Design a protein around this ligand. Structure first.
Ligand SMILES: Nc1ncnc2c1ncn2[C@@H]1O[C@H](COP(=O)(O)OP(=O)(O)NP(=O)(O)O)[C@@H](O)[C@H]1O
Ligand SMILES: Nc1ncnc2c1ncn2[C@@H]1O[C@H](COP(=O)(O)OP(=O)(O)NP(=O)(O)O)[C@@H](O)[C@H]1O
Ligand SMILES: O=C(O)CCCCCC(=O)O
Ligand SMILES: O=C(O)CCCCCC(=O)O
Ligand SMILES: [Mg+2]
Ligand SMILES: [Mg+2]
Ligand SMILES: [Mg+2]
Ligand SMILES: [Mg+2]
Lengths: 253, 252
C-alpha cells in the first residue's frame, strides 16, 4: 500500500478578499513526485490566460483513505460549428441522460449568475434549485488524478490529443460520474482561449462538444445535476475527500 | 517594482492545527521574477529537514502593498562557551544587560518548556511577567523580511562568520524584531537536533551569539520576545507580520 498525497493549488488576482479566480488545480501523487508536481501547479498558475496572480497557495497532505482506481469514462467527440449548436446538443444529451427538460432550462437561466463560482454548482433535479450552500466558492472536487504515462497511452488509443486539460477534466468527470447521486455534469472552460466543453454521465460517458462558447469570453460552467435523498453535505464530502486514480486498461480491448 | 511575501510551513503527523509536529517554516521577500527559485528553495528546505519528513506543507505568496524599508543588520558578537548551562546563564546575563528584570527572566524560563511546541515566537510582557499573545501553539510568525545573498556573503566575509543560511535568516529576523521600539530583547535557540548555537538580541548589545544553548539531539527550541510597550498586542503582532524589511549591510 503506497502512500499518496493530495496536492492542491489556487491562485487569484486583486487579493485572495474578493479577487478574480485565476487558476486551481488538484493532484494525487506518491511522495517522489512532489517536486515535479508542485512545480507543475506553480507554473499552471503563473502562465494562465486569465492573467497573472498576485496570490497563490499550494498545499500537500497525506491521504489516509485507501485509494480506488477506476477506468475513465468512454469518450465521444461531437464536432459542432458554433457555440449555439454545441449548447443545443448539450441540452439534448442532458435530457437523454435523464435530466428533465424543465430542470435543464431552469439551470440554464442560472448559469450566468454562477460564472464566478470557483468550483462546481450542485443542482437538485427534484426541487429544480441549487442544492449546495457554498455560494461563490462552489464545491471543489479534489483527490483525483491520472498518472501521465497511462493517460498518454489512453489518448493515443482514443485518437484524442494528449492535453493536460483533457486529462484533468476526464479525471474529474470520471470521479464525479461514479458518484451514485450524480446524474449528469455540464462543463465548459472559464479560459478565454478554450471553447471546448462537455456533458458527462453514466450512460453517455464523456461527450465532448467542440464549441460551447466564443473565444475571448471568461464565463465558464461546472454544474452537477444531482438526484439524491441524502444530505448534500455527505455528497460534498465524498467529492472533496474520496481519493481516485484513473487507470485505463488497454487490456480490456 | 513590487515585492512578494513567500511563506512556507511544514509538519508531520498532520497539520500543526491537528496536532502535527512542526518540521520547518520559512519566509522570503522577493521580486516576482525570483518566484520559481524561491518556491523551490522553500519546498526543498521543508523536505530535507533534520526534524524529519513532512506529510503536510503549505506554500503561499502574496503581493506586498506596504513600502519596503531597508536597514542594517545588528552588530554581531560570538560568545564561545563550553556547555549549554554556561550558555543559558550567559543568555540570562545578557537579557538583564539589555534591560529585562531578573524576575521577568525567571518567570519566562519557567514557561519555556511549555512553549516547545510553538511554531513562531512567544511575546512576553515585562509589565505582567506573563505571555502576552493569545496565539497559543501557532505563536507569532515574523514575516516579510529578507537579505539578498550577495550582500549577506559580503557581510559574512567581513564579519569572519560563516555564510550559512541559518545565520542570514536569524540575523534578518532579529534585526527586524529589534528595530521595533516595543521589543526590549529576544531570546532564541534552534529546535533542530543538529544545531546548538543560539542568541540573545537587543538594541544595546546587538546580536549576541552563544555557541551552545542546548544538547545535540534535542528538539526543544525557543523564540521569545520581551515586550515593553504601551499598545495592545494585536498591533505589535500586525507590525511583526506585515512590515516589510530588507537587510542591506554597508561597512563602517
Ligand atoms: N476540481 C474542480 N471541482 C469543481 N469544479 C471545478 C474544478 N476544476 C474546475 N472547476 C470548475 O469548472 C470551471 C472550468 O474549469 P477549469 O477551466 O479547469 O478552471 P480551474 O480548474 O479553476 N483553473 P485552470 O484549470 O487553471 O484553468 C472552473 O471555473 C470551475 O468553476
Ligand atoms: N519567522 C519567525 N517568526 C517567529 N518565530 C520564528 C521564526 N522562525 C523561527 N521561529 C521560532 O524559532 C525557532 C527556531 O527557529 P528555526 O530553527 O529557523 O525554526 P523554523 O524557521 O521554524 N524552521 P527551519 O528554519 O526550517 O529549521 C522555531 O522553532 C520557531 O519557534
Ligand atoms: O480545462 C478546461 O479548460 C475546462 C474543461 C475543458 C476540457 C474539455 C476537453 O477538451 O475534453
Ligand atoms: O536556524 C536555526 O536553526 C536557528 C539558529 C539561530 C542562531 C543562528 C546563528 O547565529 O548561528
Ligand atoms: Mg482545471
Ligand atoms: Mg480555467
Ligand atoms: Mg527558520
Ligand atoms: Mg528549526
Amino acid at each position: 500500500e503506497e502512500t499518496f498525497y493530495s496536492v492542491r493549488m489556487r491562485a487569484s488576482m486583486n487579493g485572495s478578499d474578493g479577487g478574480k479566480h485565476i487558476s486551481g488545480g488538484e493532484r494525487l501523487i506518491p511522495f517522489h513526485e512532489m517536486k515535479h508536481t508542485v512545480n507543475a501547479l506553480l507554473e499552471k498558475g503563473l502562465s494562465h490566460s486569465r492573467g497573472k496572480p498576485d496570490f497563490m497557495q499550494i498545499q500537500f497532505e497525506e491521504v489516509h483513505e485507501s485509494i480506488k482506481t477506476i477506468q475513465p469514462l468512454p469518450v465521444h467527440t461531437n464536432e459542432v460549428s458554433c457555440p449555439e449548436e454545441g449548447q443545443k446538443l448539450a441540452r439534448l444529451l442532458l435530457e437523454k441522460e435523464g435530466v428533465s427538460r424543465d430542470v435543464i432550462e431552469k439551470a440554464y437561466e442560472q448559469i450566468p449568475e454562477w460564472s464566478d463560482v470557483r468550483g462546481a454548482v450542485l443542482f437538485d433535479i427534484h426541487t429544480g434549485k441549487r442544492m449546495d450552500q457554498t455560494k461563490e466558492k462552489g464545491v471543489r472536487v479534489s483527490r483525483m488524478d491520472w498518472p501521465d504515462a497511462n493517460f498518454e497511452k489512453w489518448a493515443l488509443h482514443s485518437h484524442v490529443p494528449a492535453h493536460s486539460r483533457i486529462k484533468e477534466a476526464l479525471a474529474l468527470a470520471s470521479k464525479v460520474s461514479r458518484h451514485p447521486a450524480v446524474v449528469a455534469e455540464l462543463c465548459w472552460s472559464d479560459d478565454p482561449d478554450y471553447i471546448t466543453g462537455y456533458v458527462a454521465g453514466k450512460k453517455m460517458g464523456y461527450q465532448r462538444i467542440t464549441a460551447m462558447k466564443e473565444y475571448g469570453t471568461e464565463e465558464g460552467c461546472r454544474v452537477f445535476f444531482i438526484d439524491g435523498s441524502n444530505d448534500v453535505n455527505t455528497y460534498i464530502h465524498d467529492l472533496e475527500k474520496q481519493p481516485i486514480l484513473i487507470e485505463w486498461e488497454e487490456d480490456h480491448d
